[PDB]
Amino acid sequence: GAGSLALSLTADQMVSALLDAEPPILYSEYDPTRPFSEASMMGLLTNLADRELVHMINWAKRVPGFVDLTLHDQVHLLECAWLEILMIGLVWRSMEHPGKLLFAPNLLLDRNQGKCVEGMVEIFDMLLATSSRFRMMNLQGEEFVCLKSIILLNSGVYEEKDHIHRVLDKITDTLIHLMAKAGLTLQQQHQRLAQLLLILSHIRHMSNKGMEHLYSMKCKNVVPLSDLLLEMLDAHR
Amino acid sequence: GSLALSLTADQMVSALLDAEPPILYSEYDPPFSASMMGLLTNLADRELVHMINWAKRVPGFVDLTLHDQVHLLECAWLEILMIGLVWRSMEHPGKLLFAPNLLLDRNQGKCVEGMVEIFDMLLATSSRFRMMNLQGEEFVCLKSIILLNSGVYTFSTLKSLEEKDHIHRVLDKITDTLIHLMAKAGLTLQQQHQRLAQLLLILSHIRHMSNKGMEHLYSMKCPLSDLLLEMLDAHR
Ligand SMILES: O=S(=O)(Oc1ccc(-n2cncn2)cc1)[C@@H]1C[C@@H]2O[C@H]1C(c1ccc(O)cc1)=C2c1ccc(O)cc1
Ligand SMILES: O=S(=O)(Oc1ccc(-n2cncn2)cc1)[C@@H]1C[C@@H]2O[C@H]1C(c1ccc(O)cc1)=C2c1ccc(O)cc1
């Protein structure tokens, strides 16, 4: 990606570009009857996540620097990052719902409704903890879209590895700009940058555990998975 | 009230440099399969014993409850072994320097299932550190961040909130220290925040290699010490 537009954006244009790329907030096409079974819970989340994936593909294309890559590399990055991206989206929209996960405006679950599925309460607790940390830090929308982009570009990274590195540097510059603009001292900026990036290691962690569980669910044959979802799972073995 | 929070950048580096565990040699006899895992398990078990003593010397660690120190080490131990390996393996392209007397390349991983994928990720991590010219002082800051960070969001009472808050104050201190080192080396502010980000993004790859590694360590049971058996009960 030598010569790329992405690398000569201002911080403010990078943010404008990322804001314009944002997917819509999806409603669940079903309201659950009450209570949940394993199968009804995994049905709602699987259905919601398949629909989110379609919109995440359109978003990825509008991320500066993403479409500079080979289609091969674009596929690898989304295959590696998709559940981290669903997760950062979930913890962001759950920030104003303490103790609750806003899967959709018509699908708000507390940690208890996680108990009907094996291993799910542990994940919910880690998602809740991440949401609470974002609330404590007062994460801003402009910071969130920068982080979501870092996840996409970073999660499968290990000309075209150096290109991804130059785009990641540009997104770092953007976060620091946003922070300076908001009146943080140079010390507060560097500290907040580190705090946000250390949360990406927790999101990577939740994704690796999530994927283990999706693979167990696959073999269990509890719910139909879409061909797309099966592709994403085969990618992780 | 932690003394960690009173240290200068230079004092934080000294404390972390002085905490470094000893360099271990492999002491398991050179079949070539049982014996690959044997090599690594015997070496890893011994490194773990020295990691427990290193952890007590990481500024801020000793201020935590015993229960929290245990949780932190159960979460971070494999990440800490892996960042050590990738540090030692920098000057040895295409190889993993497990010990001064135990240099493997990715072909050796083949003797075990799913180990070559981990070795490729470890090797690629080692090359990225080399490319970046990672300094010893940065490496010790990164290793301490992994210990304090990896378990912080999986501790819930009034005491825990104090614990989490102490950890966040110490992490901010280590952040100040990394920046100081970078400015000391004459990086511009821009280069400093870019280098900080590059280093911290690698930590998310180290977490990923640890998650993948713990999967294969758990299935490996399905010749391990009670210590290693204990450590797998955490990551169930
Ligand atoms: O870690 S999870 O809680 O997932 C499982 C736990 C146990 C199981 N077992 C099922 N049987 C046995 N175990 C199976 C799965 C994982 C994170 C979160 O809960 C899951 C999930 C999700 C993704 C894709 C999918 O198809 C179905 C579910 C989430 C999610 C996040 C954001 C979003 O916008 C939409 C969905
Ligand atoms: O991610 S791994 O490659 O782990 C496994 C992969 C496949 C297996 N399979 C076993 N059967 C089939 N696959 C089993 C485990 C992990 C990283 C590296 O190789 C392993 C290992 C290690 C740690 C502890 C232990 O008790 C036994 C082995 C390493 C290590 C790293 C730094 C260090 O300083 C010392 C040791």
mmCIF file with all atom_site columns, C-alpha atoms in Angstrom, chain A residues 2-136:
data_model
loop_
_atom_site.group_PDB
_atom_site.id
_atom_site.type_symbol
_atom_site.label_atom_id
_atom_site.label_alt_id
_atom_site.label_comp_id
_atom_site.label_asym_id
_atom_site.label_entity_id
_atom_site.label_seq_id
_atom_site.pdbx_PDB_ins_code
_atom_site.Cartn_x
_atom_site.Cartn_y
_atom_site.Cartn_z
_atom_site.occupancy
_atom_site.B_iso_or_equiv
_atom_site.pdbx_formal_charge
_atom_site.auth_seq_id
_atom_site.auth_comp_id
_atom_site.auth_asym_id
_atom_site.auth_atom_id
_atom_site.pdbx_PDB_model_num
ATOM 1   C CA . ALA A 1 2   ? 2.738   2.558   -0.984 1.00 0.00 ? 2   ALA A CA 1
ATOM 2   C CA . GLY A 1 3   ? 1.199   6.023   -1.838 1.00 0.00 ? 3   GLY A CA 1
ATOM 3   C CA . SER A 1 4   ? -2.049  5.210   0.118  1.00 0.00 ? 4   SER A CA 1
ATOM 4   C CA . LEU A 1 5   ? -4.562  8.011   0.974  1.00 0.00 ? 5   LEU A CA 1
ATOM 5   C CA . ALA A 1 6   ? -4.907  6.365   4.455  1.00 0.00 ? 6   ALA A CA 1
ATOM 6   C CA . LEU A 1 7   ? -1.332  7.493   5.404  1.00 0.00 ? 7   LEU A CA 1
ATOM 7   C CA . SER A 1 8   ? -1.909  11.212  4.446  1.00 0.00 ? 8   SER A CA 1
ATOM 8   C CA . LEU A 1 9   ? -5.248  11.665  6.327  1.00 0.00 ? 9   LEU A CA 1
ATOM 9   C CA . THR A 1 10  ? -5.299  14.177  9.185  1.00 0.00 ? 10  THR A CA 1
ATOM 10  C CA . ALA A 1 11  ? -6.303  12.802  12.612 1.00 0.00 ? 11  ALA A CA 1
ATOM 11  C CA . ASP A 1 12  ? -9.739  14.523  12.161 1.00 0.00 ? 12  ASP A CA 1
ATOM 12  C CA . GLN A 1 13  ? -10.217 13.029  8.633  1.00 0.00 ? 13  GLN A CA 1
ATOM 13  C CA . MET A 1 14  ? -9.250  9.551   9.974  1.00 0.00 ? 14  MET A CA 1
ATOM 14  C CA . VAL A 1 15  ? -12.019 9.902   12.648 1.00 0.00 ? 15  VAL A CA 1
ATOM 15  C CA . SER A 1 16  ? -14.547 11.296  10.117 1.00 0.00 ? 16  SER A CA 1
ATOM 16  C CA . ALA A 1 17  ? -13.722 8.322   7.838  1.00 0.00 ? 17  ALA A CA 1
ATOM 17  C CA . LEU A 1 18  ? -14.127 5.818   10.755 1.00 0.00 ? 18  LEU A CA 1
ATOM 18  C CA . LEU A 1 19  ? -17.373 7.483   11.989 1.00 0.00 ? 19  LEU A CA 1
ATOM 19  C CA . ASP A 1 20  ? -18.832 7.341   8.441  1.00 0.00 ? 20  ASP A CA 1
ATOM 20  C CA . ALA A 1 21  ? -17.959 3.594   8.174  1.00 0.00 ? 21  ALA A CA 1
ATOM 21  C CA . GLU A 1 22  ? -19.936 2.684   11.372 1.00 0.00 ? 22  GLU A CA 1
ATOM 22  C CA . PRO A 1 23  ? -22.346 -0.274  11.075 1.00 0.00 ? 23  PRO A CA 1
ATOM 23  C CA . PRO A 1 24  ? -25.953 0.148   12.290 1.00 0.00 ? 24  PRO A CA 1
ATOM 24  C CA . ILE A 1 25  ? -27.041 -1.020  15.774 1.00 0.00 ? 25  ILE A CA 1
ATOM 25  C CA . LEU A 1 26  ? -29.093 -4.207  14.953 1.00 0.00 ? 26  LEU A CA 1
ATOM 26  C CA . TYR A 1 27  ? -32.245 -5.292  16.838 1.00 0.00 ? 27  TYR A CA 1
ATOM 27  C CA . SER A 1 28  ? -32.854 -9.023  17.406 1.00 0.00 ? 28  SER A CA 1
ATOM 28  C CA . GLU A 1 29  ? -35.407 -10.107 14.713 1.00 0.00 ? 29  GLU A CA 1
ATOM 29  C CA . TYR A 1 30  ? -36.963 -12.265 17.549 1.00 0.00 ? 30  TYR A CA 1
ATOM 30  C CA . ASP A 1 31  ? -37.845 -11.553 21.176 1.00 0.00 ? 31  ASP A CA 1
ATOM 31  C CA . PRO A 1 32  ? -37.069 -14.618 23.306 1.00 0.00 ? 32  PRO A CA 1
ATOM 32  C CA . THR A 1 33  ? -39.946 -16.340 25.129 1.00 0.00 ? 33  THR A CA 1
ATOM 33  C CA . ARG A 1 34  ? -38.918 -16.670 28.841 1.00 0.00 ? 34  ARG A CA 1
ATOM 34  C CA . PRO A 1 35  ? -36.874 -18.323 30.135 1.00 0.00 ? 35  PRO A CA 1
ATOM 35  C CA . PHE A 1 36  ? -33.953 -19.263 27.763 1.00 0.00 ? 36  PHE A CA 1
ATOM 36  C CA . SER A 1 37  ? -32.812 -22.774 26.751 1.00 0.00 ? 37  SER A CA 1
ATOM 37  C CA . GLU A 1 38  ? -29.196 -23.424 25.636 1.00 0.00 ? 38  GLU A CA 1
ATOM 38  C CA . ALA A 1 39  ? -30.684 -23.745 22.087 1.00 0.00 ? 39  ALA A CA 1
ATOM 39  C CA . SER A 1 40  ? -32.835 -20.531 22.189 1.00 0.00 ? 40  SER A CA 1
ATOM 40  C CA . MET A 1 41  ? -29.968 -18.444 23.716 1.00 0.00 ? 41  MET A CA 1
ATOM 41  C CA . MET A 1 42  ? -27.390 -19.785 21.170 1.00 0.00 ? 42  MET A CA 1
ATOM 42  C CA . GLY A 1 43  ? -30.057 -19.306 18.434 1.00 0.00 ? 43  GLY A CA 1
ATOM 43  C CA . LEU A 1 44  ? -30.545 -15.557 19.234 1.00 0.00 ? 44  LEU A CA 1
ATOM 44  C CA . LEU A 1 45  ? -26.802 -14.787 19.590 1.00 0.00 ? 45  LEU A CA 1
ATOM 45  C CA . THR A 1 46  ? -25.859 -16.843 16.441 1.00 0.00 ? 46  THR A CA 1
ATOM 46  C CA . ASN A 1 47  ? -28.625 -15.116 14.399 1.00 0.00 ? 47  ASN A CA 1
ATOM 47  C CA . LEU A 1 48  ? -27.616 -11.644 15.669 1.00 0.00 ? 48  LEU A CA 1
ATOM 48  C CA . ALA A 1 49  ? -23.874 -12.345 15.125 1.00 0.00 ? 49  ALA A CA 1
ATOM 49  C CA . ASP A 1 50  ? -24.429 -13.641 11.491 1.00 0.00 ? 50  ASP A CA 1
ATOM 50  C CA . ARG A 1 51  ? -26.337 -10.391 10.706 1.00 0.00 ? 51  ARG A CA 1
ATOM 51  C CA . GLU A 1 52  ? -23.584 -8.277  12.425 1.00 0.00 ? 52  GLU A CA 1
ATOM 52  C CA . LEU A 1 53  ? -20.905 -10.081 10.290 1.00 0.00 ? 53  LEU A CA 1
ATOM 53  C CA . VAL A 1 54  ? -22.597 -8.987  7.034  1.00 0.00 ? 54  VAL A CA 1
ATOM 54  C CA . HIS A 1 55  ? -22.483 -5.306  8.206  1.00 0.00 ? 55  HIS A CA 1
ATOM 55  C CA . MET A 1 56  ? -18.906 -5.784  9.596  1.00 0.00 ? 56  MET A CA 1
ATOM 56  C CA . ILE A 1 57  ? -17.714 -6.761  6.050  1.00 0.00 ? 57  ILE A CA 1
ATOM 57  C CA . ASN A 1 58  ? -19.126 -3.434  4.643  1.00 0.00 ? 58  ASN A CA 1
ATOM 58  C CA . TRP A 1 59  ? -17.488 -1.521  7.565  1.00 0.00 ? 59  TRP A CA 1
ATOM 59  C CA . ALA A 1 60  ? -14.038 -3.194  7.061  1.00 0.00 ? 60  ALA A CA 1
ATOM 60  C CA . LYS A 1 61  ? -13.939 -1.942  3.405  1.00 0.00 ? 61  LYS A CA 1
ATOM 61  C CA . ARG A 1 62  ? -14.400 1.702   4.602  1.00 0.00 ? 62  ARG A CA 1
ATOM 62  C CA . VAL A 1 63  ? -11.559 1.438   7.198  1.00 0.00 ? 63  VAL A CA 1
ATOM 63  C CA . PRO A 1 64  ? -8.604  3.476   5.820  1.00 0.00 ? 64  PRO A CA 1
ATOM 64  C CA . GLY A 1 65  ? -5.764  1.186   4.715  1.00 0.00 ? 65  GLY A CA 1
ATOM 65  C CA . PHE A 1 66  ? -7.817  -2.076  4.885  1.00 0.00 ? 66  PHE A CA 1
ATOM 66  C CA . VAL A 1 67  ? -8.725  -2.121  1.148  1.00 0.00 ? 67  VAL A CA 1
ATOM 67  C CA . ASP A 1 68  ? -5.014  -1.355  0.286  1.00 0.00 ? 68  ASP A CA 1
ATOM 68  C CA . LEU A 1 69  ? -4.370  -5.051  1.154  1.00 0.00 ? 69  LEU A CA 1
ATOM 69  C CA . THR A 1 70  ? -4.712  -8.130  -1.094 1.00 0.00 ? 70  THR A CA 1
ATOM 70  C CA . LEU A 1 71  ? -8.139  -9.771  -0.852 1.00 0.00 ? 71  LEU A CA 1
ATOM 71  C CA . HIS A 1 72  ? -6.170  -12.727 0.702  1.00 0.00 ? 72  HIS A CA 1
ATOM 72  C CA . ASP A 1 73  ? -4.882  -10.459 3.535  1.00 0.00 ? 73  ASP A CA 1
ATOM 73  C CA . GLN A 1 74  ? -8.311  -8.752  4.008  1.00 0.00 ? 74  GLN A CA 1
ATOM 74  C CA . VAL A 1 75  ? -9.879  -12.248 4.480  1.00 0.00 ? 75  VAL A CA 1
ATOM 75  C CA . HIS A 1 76  ? -7.158  -13.283 7.005  1.00 0.00 ? 76  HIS A CA 1
ATOM 76  C CA . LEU A 1 77  ? -7.575  -10.077 9.105  1.00 0.00 ? 77  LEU A CA 1
ATOM 77  C CA . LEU A 1 78  ? -11.432 -10.421 9.326  1.00 0.00 ? 78  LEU A CA 1
ATOM 78  C CA . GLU A 1 79  ? -11.169 -14.228 9.992  1.00 0.00 ? 79  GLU A CA 1
ATOM 79  C CA . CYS A 1 80  ? -8.782  -13.412 12.929 1.00 0.00 ? 80  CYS A CA 1
ATOM 80  C CA . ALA A 1 81  ? -10.584 -10.296 14.299 1.00 0.00 ? 81  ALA A CA 1
ATOM 81  C CA . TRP A 1 82  ? -14.368 -10.758 13.752 1.00 0.00 ? 82  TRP A CA 1
ATOM 82  C CA . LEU A 1 83  ? -15.312 -11.940 17.295 1.00 0.00 ? 83  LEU A CA 1
ATOM 83  C CA . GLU A 1 84  ? -12.955 -9.314  18.906 1.00 0.00 ? 84  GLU A CA 1
ATOM 84  C CA . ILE A 1 85  ? -14.845 -6.751  16.779 1.00 0.00 ? 85  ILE A CA 1
ATOM 85  C CA . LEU A 1 86  ? -18.306 -8.077  17.806 1.00 0.00 ? 86  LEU A CA 1
ATOM 86  C CA . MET A 1 87  ? -17.063 -8.063  21.445 1.00 0.00 ? 87  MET A CA 1
ATOM 87  C CA . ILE A 1 88  ? -15.670 -4.478  21.426 1.00 0.00 ? 88  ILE A CA 1
ATOM 88  C CA . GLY A 1 89  ? -19.007 -3.424  19.807 1.00 0.00 ? 89  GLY A CA 1
ATOM 89  C CA . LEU A 1 90  ? -20.988 -5.180  22.582 1.00 0.00 ? 90  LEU A CA 1
ATOM 90  C CA . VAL A 1 91  ? -18.914 -3.754  25.493 1.00 0.00 ? 91  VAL A CA 1
ATOM 91  C CA . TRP A 1 92  ? -19.183 -0.221  23.935 1.00 0.00 ? 92  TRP A CA 1
ATOM 92  C CA . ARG A 1 93  ? -22.990 -0.306  23.577 1.00 0.00 ? 93  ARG A CA 1
ATOM 93  C CA . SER A 1 94  ? -23.294 -1.909  27.093 1.00 0.00 ? 94  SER A CA 1
ATOM 94  C CA . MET A 1 95  ? -21.370 1.018   28.804 1.00 0.00 ? 95  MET A CA 1
ATOM 95  C CA . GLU A 1 96  ? -24.601 2.807   29.925 1.00 0.00 ? 96  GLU A CA 1
ATOM 96  C CA . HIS A 1 97  ? -26.198 -0.499  31.134 1.00 0.00 ? 97  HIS A CA 1
ATOM 97  C CA . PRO A 1 98  ? -24.202 -1.359  34.287 1.00 0.00 ? 98  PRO A CA 1
ATOM 98  C CA . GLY A 1 99  ? -24.286 -5.121  35.111 1.00 0.00 ? 99  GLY A CA 1
ATOM 99  C CA . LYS A 1 100 ? -25.925 -5.769  31.664 1.00 0.00 ? 100 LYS A CA 1
ATOM 100 C CA . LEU A 1 101 ? -24.894 -6.736  28.108 1.00 0.00 ? 101 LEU A CA 1
ATOM 101 C CA . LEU A 1 102 ? -26.831 -4.823  25.384 1.00 0.00 ? 102 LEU A CA 1
ATOM 102 C CA . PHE A 1 103 ? -26.635 -7.482  22.633 1.00 0.00 ? 103 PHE A CA 1
ATOM 103 C CA . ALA A 1 104 ? -29.410 -5.398  20.979 1.00 0.00 ? 104 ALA A CA 1
ATOM 104 C CA . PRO A 1 105 ? -31.819 -2.672  22.177 1.00 0.00 ? 105 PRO A CA 1
ATOM 105 C CA . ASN A 1 106 ? -34.422 -5.524  22.517 1.00 0.00 ? 106 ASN A CA 1
ATOM 106 C CA . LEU A 1 107 ? -31.859 -8.017  23.990 1.00 0.00 ? 107 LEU A CA 1
ATOM 107 C CA . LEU A 1 108 ? -30.336 -6.833  27.297 1.00 0.00 ? 108 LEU A CA 1
ATOM 108 C CA . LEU A 1 109 ? -28.996 -9.817  29.368 1.00 0.00 ? 109 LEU A CA 1
ATOM 109 C CA . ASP A 1 110 ? -27.489 -9.791  32.901 1.00 0.00 ? 110 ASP A CA 1
ATOM 110 C CA . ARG A 1 111 ? -24.877 -12.463 33.891 1.00 0.00 ? 111 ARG A CA 1
ATOM 111 C CA . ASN A 1 112 ? -27.620 -14.865 35.245 1.00 0.00 ? 112 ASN A CA 1
ATOM 112 C CA . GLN A 1 113 ? -29.165 -15.547 31.758 1.00 0.00 ? 113 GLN A CA 1
ATOM 113 C CA . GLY A 1 114 ? -25.611 -16.717 30.833 1.00 0.00 ? 114 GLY A CA 1
ATOM 114 C CA . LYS A 1 115 ? -26.019 -19.746 33.204 1.00 0.00 ? 115 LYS A CA 1
ATOM 115 C CA . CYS A 1 116 ? -28.273 -21.776 30.773 1.00 0.00 ? 116 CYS A CA 1
ATOM 116 C CA . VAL A 1 117 ? -25.121 -22.225 28.494 1.00 0.00 ? 117 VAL A CA 1
ATOM 117 C CA . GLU A 1 118 ? -21.887 -24.005 29.629 1.00 0.00 ? 118 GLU A CA 1
ATOM 118 C CA . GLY A 1 119 ? -18.918 -21.561 30.046 1.00 0.00 ? 119 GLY A CA 1
ATOM 119 C CA . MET A 1 120 ? -21.003 -18.498 29.048 1.00 0.00 ? 120 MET A CA 1
ATOM 120 C CA . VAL A 1 121 ? -21.306 -16.872 32.527 1.00 0.00 ? 121 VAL A CA 1
ATOM 121 C CA . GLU A 1 122 ? -17.439 -16.608 32.701 1.00 0.00 ? 122 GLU A CA 1
ATOM 122 C CA . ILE A 1 123 ? -17.413 -14.789 29.256 1.00 0.00 ? 123 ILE A CA 1
ATOM 123 C CA . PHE A 1 124 ? -20.334 -12.506 30.265 1.00 0.00 ? 124 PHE A CA 1
ATOM 124 C CA . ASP A 1 125 ? -18.426 -11.542 33.469 1.00 0.00 ? 125 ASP A CA 1
ATOM 125 C CA . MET A 1 126 ? -15.266 -10.660 31.401 1.00 0.00 ? 126 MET A CA 1
ATOM 126 C CA . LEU A 1 127 ? -17.451 -8.681  28.887 1.00 0.00 ? 127 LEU A CA 1
ATOM 127 C CA . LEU A 1 128 ? -19.223 -6.883  31.822 1.00 0.00 ? 128 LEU A CA 1
ATOM 128 C CA . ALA A 1 129 ? -15.781 -6.141  33.448 1.00 0.00 ? 129 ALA A CA 1
ATOM 129 C CA . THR A 1 130 ? -14.570 -4.664  30.099 1.00 0.00 ? 130 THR A CA 1
ATOM 130 C CA . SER A 1 131 ? -17.736 -2.541  29.725 1.00 0.00 ? 131 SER A CA 1
ATOM 131 C CA . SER A 1 132 ? -17.344 -1.285  33.342 1.00 0.00 ? 132 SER A CA 1
ATOM 132 C CA . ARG A 1 133 ? -13.621 -0.396  32.653 1.00 0.00 ? 133 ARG A CA 1
ATOM 133 C CA . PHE A 1 134 ? -14.709 1.613   29.525 1.00 0.00 ? 134 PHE A CA 1
ATOM 134 C CA . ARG A 1 135 ? -17.374 3.396   31.647 1.00 0.00 ? 135 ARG A CA 1
ATOM 135 C CA . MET A 1 136 ? -14.776 4.152   34.405 1.00 0.00 ? 136 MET A CA 1
#
